[PDB]
Amino acid sequence: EKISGDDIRNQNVLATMAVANVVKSSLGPVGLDKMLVDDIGDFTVTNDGATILSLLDVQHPAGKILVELAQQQDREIGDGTTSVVIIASELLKRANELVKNKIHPTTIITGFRVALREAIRFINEVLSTSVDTLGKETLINIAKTSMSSKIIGADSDFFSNMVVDALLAVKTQNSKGEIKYPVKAVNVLKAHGKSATESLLVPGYALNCTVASQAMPKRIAGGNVKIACLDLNLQKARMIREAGIVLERVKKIIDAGAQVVLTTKGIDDLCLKEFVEAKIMGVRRCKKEDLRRIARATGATLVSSMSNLEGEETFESSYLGLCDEVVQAKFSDDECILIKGTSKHSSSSIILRGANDYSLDEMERSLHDSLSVVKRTLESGNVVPGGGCVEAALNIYLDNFATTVGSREQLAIAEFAAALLIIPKTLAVNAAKDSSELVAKLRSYHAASQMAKPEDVKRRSYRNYGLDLIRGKIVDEIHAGVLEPTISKVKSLKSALEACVAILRIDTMITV
């Protein structure tokens, strides 16, 4: 058969809308997940909108582009496939209404490309660098809402400053200005001796071990100290000389200037006696998992067996580490080893406190999902406020920009800016909030704040107001903790625009 004329234009709208109705309920964290049933009879339950579009059967070409649209979003940013489909679905409905107005789709496509180029410059005045890092903390609301489902959420108000203050210290530079936060940092050590009020923040490396010797002092070489991480013990080795094999390695450590010796399998008593006269503190039964992360920060290397070819030695302070000072404070019924002021660390350690070991495991996984959301957004130095502030701000800017043409696209730009109102609309539906109130008041606050902006003179700012669906009130998203990087919003509007253009460019369909 053959389909041409206005029949294919209305057919693509009904086909795209039927496919878009699946992701309309999954928008936002308050959204509701849906089930995917196949012909075999099995099913699945997930809240990810990207996996739903891949398993969704679409028999029409208008929805097939939306299927491949999620592939371009996952291969670049990797998130936001739900919001991109909703944007592309509304742009088709607004463009379909312009057909009865005798407006040619090429100018509609051109009108969207001109508004897309100016939308990037409009975000520049929106997006900003990291702010409110002195005098307040904007990241305390992220950990409070994420852990609110756990017992730790009650005390998370005091525990929020532990993660925020340590997050500024863990920044580093790997290769050519990456500025990324380490995923394996923030060592976890759980012990319960008392109430959780005693929780303290340790800005350094905390190793769980003992001194094993009461004769030597606990503070030695405050200026500089070298840490030597070893695996094989210094004890007498078996298969008559047997004790002299490990004794030679003891003199190599003393001549290397290592005040602290870390052995995985421990240290014998004969080797410990020689460590007293040399003021070297040995440690027995070290944790092999913590030695790998400490060696990378101190410039050391884990050594399972000490040798080169036919020789045995420390290579003259090669595998040894570097640290400013090592001192052990009284931990109030806890014993560990504090390591701070290394060459390059960009990490820390946090001691968990809870009611029992089951609560310590739940509080351990809570900080994993909490800090992750914080570090993935702050990984990029350019972020924008979320919660609907991106779609609402462009509606005010493109409203006055439509007067620049004043011929045709003025009607298309007005419909393009008004099409972004569908994101906050459907967002409040699953939150049990009225879409005609919070969305209506969302535009009033942004329109009044931009009146005195171009004049470079203002009394009070009162800008950047988003939508808070938990308490149902208008608050600042910067203080609320909802942030998204700019690279995610630029690729979202760019992919959603090209997806709607490919549908509007089809005036004929040949179906065999």
Binding site: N21, V22, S25, V30, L32, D33, K34, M35, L36, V37, D38, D39, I40, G41, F43, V45, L55, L56, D57, V58, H192, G193, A355, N356, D357, Y358, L360, N430, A431, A432
Partner: protein, 485 residues
């Protein structure tokens, strides 16, 4: 709203079948198979499994019954009916009242917290160390079965099994383990055909049915040494002894191998004063390493000296049940004897259900009354807290109280009395009098449970309302159903 109706209809149609399957007086269900067969069993697990399903909500309720079976032995139909009634009471509130579904979900989560608090208030403690008190508890799953005559002997076998793997420890330093118990791997038992139940003993260790290579052997050793290796015994005459010479360096009292043992290796190990076992399965060697600690090592020269043979009671090879056995007595293995294999198969499922009742009592002394007593006791407290709860969630919060009254009303419909008349009378007994007044299955008139204690462990009631909220809220979140791969 079409998908929300199908989610409630599918969940109600499945629960409607087992409405007559609840209680000791419960009716019977007859399923029609495409062949000339039929199923007369009233168990909700065997009925709904053989029923063809279409809507995906029916398959979600089937997996809920399989999860409850691994936890508790009884109350399978109680969780399904309770989870299905919640969606039925919220049907007019979701459509006619136009209440947002998340508000109902947030109301069920708030009602779930208050429901667990009411159960803890009406729960009473019991001594877990009394052997005579534990017999009247498990008896609920004993009677009306062939094991009622052996109930005295069945309780001794069930209690000694769960007391072996449990560890009682607590303090403010290392935390509370909350009495971690594994029935599957550790309490797994092997049944021996023939014999009598009276001669069945509870052994702690791994059981082996293989015989001994020589009749004359030491039956007990002060400090035994057990070595576990999968390498067989054969020429890889001095080379056969050379492989055994590396084993005898630690002077083992027991030698276990996976494959057979040659006759040449039996003579070299006979003078060494050790035990030889052959044809031992590989799966049994993994359980021996837990009670012993000997690590399986391929080559005999790599055997470590760290492992020992400690915690081995006796080497006795004495024949039990006309067959040579091997007794190695956080693990145990019970040797059961019965009049036939069909009798042992019935004891199998009955022993697991008997230990599940005794275990739930050990997780906490708090016991809860059954037969609609706890169901009505919570519904009275839900109505009082409803008037004090402000917000739109107050209306869906009252739907839980109507769902709590469906379980006792279900038993009344099968009892023969008026479900409307006996509901208002039983509800007034909880407001004025105590909460211990239930419904009698034999008579059918409202009576006190003090005479015959119906009390059940709280763990059955905990997971009952727990998983019911998670199963009801799961179907309400799906607003669309599509077909595709």
């Amino acid at each position: 709203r079409q998908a929300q109706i199908s989610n409630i209809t599918a969940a109600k149609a499945v629960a409607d079948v087992i409405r007559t399957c609840l209680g000791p007086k419960a009716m019977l269900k007859m399923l029609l198979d495409p062949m000339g067969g039929l199923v007369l069993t009233n168990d909700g697990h065997a009925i709904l499994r053989e029923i063809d399903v279409a809507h995906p909500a029916a398959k979600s309720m089937l997996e809920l019954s399989r999860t409850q079976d691994e936890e508790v032995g009884d109350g399978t139909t109680t969780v399904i009916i309770l989870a299905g009634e919640i969606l039925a009471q919220c049907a007019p509130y979701l459509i006619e009242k136009n209440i947002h579904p998340v508000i109902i979900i947030q109301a069920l989560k708030k009602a779930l917290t208050d429901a667990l608090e009411v159960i803890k208030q009406v729960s009473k403690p019991v001594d877990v160390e009394n052997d005579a008190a534990m017999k009247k508890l498990i008896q609920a799953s004993i009677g009306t079965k062939y094991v009622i005559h052996w109930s005295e002997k069945m309780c001794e076998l069930a209690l000694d099994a769960v007391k072996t793997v449990r560890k009682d420890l607590g303090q403010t330093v290392e935390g509370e383990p909350n009495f971690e118990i594994d029935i599957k791997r550790y309490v797994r038992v092997e049944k021996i055909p023939g014999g009598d139940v009276l001669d069945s003993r509870v052994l702690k260790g791994v059981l082996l049915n293989k015989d001994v290579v020589h009749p004359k052997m030491s039956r007990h050793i002060e400090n035994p040494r057990v070595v576990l290796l999968d390498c067989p015994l054969e020429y890889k005459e001095e080379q056969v002894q050379l492989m055994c010479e590396q084993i005898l360096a630690v002077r083992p009292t027991l030698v276990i191998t996976e494959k057979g043992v040659s006759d040449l290796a039996q003579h070299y190990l006979l003078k060494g004063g050790c035990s030889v076992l052959r044809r031992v399965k590989k799966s049994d060697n993994n359980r021996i390493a837990r009670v012993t600690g000997a690590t399986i090592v391929n080559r005999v020269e790599d055997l470590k000296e760290s492992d020992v043979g400690t915690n081995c009671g006796l080497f006795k090879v004495e024949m039990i049940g006309d067959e040579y056995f091997s007794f190695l007595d956080k693990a145990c293995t019970i040797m059961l004897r019965g009049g036939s294999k069909d009798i042992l198969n019935e004891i199998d499922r009955n022993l697991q259900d008997a230990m599940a009742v005794a275990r739930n009592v050990m997780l906490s002394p708090s016991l809860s009354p059954g037969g609609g007593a706890t169901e009505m006791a919570v519904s009275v407290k839900l109505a009082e807290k409803a008037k004090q709860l402000e917000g739109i969630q107050q209306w869906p919060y009252q739907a839980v109280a109507d769902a709590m009254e469906c379980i006792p009303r279900t038993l009344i419909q099968n009892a023969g009395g008026d479900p409307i008349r006996l509901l208002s009378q039983l509800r007034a007994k909880h407001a004025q009098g105590n909460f211990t007044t239930g419904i009698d299955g034999d008579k059918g008139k409202i009576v006190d449970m003090v005479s015959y204690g119906i009390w059940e462990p709280e763990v059955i009631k905990q997971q009952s309302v727990k998983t019911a909220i998670e199963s009801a809220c799961l179907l309400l979140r799906v607003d669309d159903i599509v077909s595709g791969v």
